[PDB]
Design a protein around this ligand. Sequence first.
Ligand SMILES: CCC[C@H](NC(=O)[C@@H]1[C@H]2CCC[C@H]2CN1C(=O)[C@@H](NC(=O)[C@@H](NC(=O)c1cnccn1)C1CCCCC1)C(C)(C)C)[C@@H](O)C(=O)NC1CC1
Ligand SMILES: [Zn+2]
Length: 199
Amino acid sequence: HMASMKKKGSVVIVGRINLSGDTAYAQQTRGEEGCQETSQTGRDKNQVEGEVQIVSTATQTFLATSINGVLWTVYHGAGTRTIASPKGPVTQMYTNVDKDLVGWQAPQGSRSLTPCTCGSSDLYLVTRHADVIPVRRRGDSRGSLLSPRPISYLKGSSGGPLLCPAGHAVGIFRTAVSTRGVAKAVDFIPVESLETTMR
Ligand SMILES: CCC[C@H](NC(=O)[C@@H]1[C@H]2CCC[C@H]2CN1C(=O)[C@@H](NC(=O)[C@@H](NC(=O)c1cnccn1)C1CCCCC1)C(C)(C)C)[C@@H](O)C(=O)NC1CC1
Ligand SMILES: [Zn+2]
């Protein structure tokens, strides 16, 4: 009974959204069997690159975004889980259920986005399928899609970035705002909220 007590696995990086060139595209770096093993050991020796990682638990796949040397994602996806790394599991450096926000030290090899300082309300959401979707900022933590999509389109994009025209991080996508299955808007965690969390 106490001896049969299992532990939750680590979050595992299973790919990335490549934003380095003219074309955004998703790359897978680990398959399902490797993911399952790595989640249990917490030992991930794969090379990490890029700003936006595709991450998985046993039950969910979603995104994580590096900003100012922290890999950030949503609490509703990651919970309090460690992330797998070459040295074994790494404990969260930030955990905030009230903001729906968690973060780990950014993996060696990752690149970070810089927080936006320009005040622009013309944003771009990067999805787990590497779509770059225009979003008009409508408040501190909400934006509207210029073209509404079924919510399926956004499933698994939580933890991904909203970017300004200059490619700086404005926020982390948290949840879709939907009506009868159509997403018309998105809620996000503003980068200023991350910056406060960091000090
Ligand atoms: C929504 C797309 C991204 C996913 N976000 C989520 O799953 C978040 C989580 C936040 C905590 C509760 C969950 C519900 N959720 C939602 O976005 C859900 N949105 C909602 O439930 C939104 N509510 C509504 O759309 C609504 C409200 N009244 C009546 C009818 N519909 C609320 C509205 C208030 C602000 C917050 C959003 C949705 C779209 C799935 C039904 C993300 O978790 C993800 O990447 N998923 C993949 C693994 C399956
Ligand atoms: Zn900016």
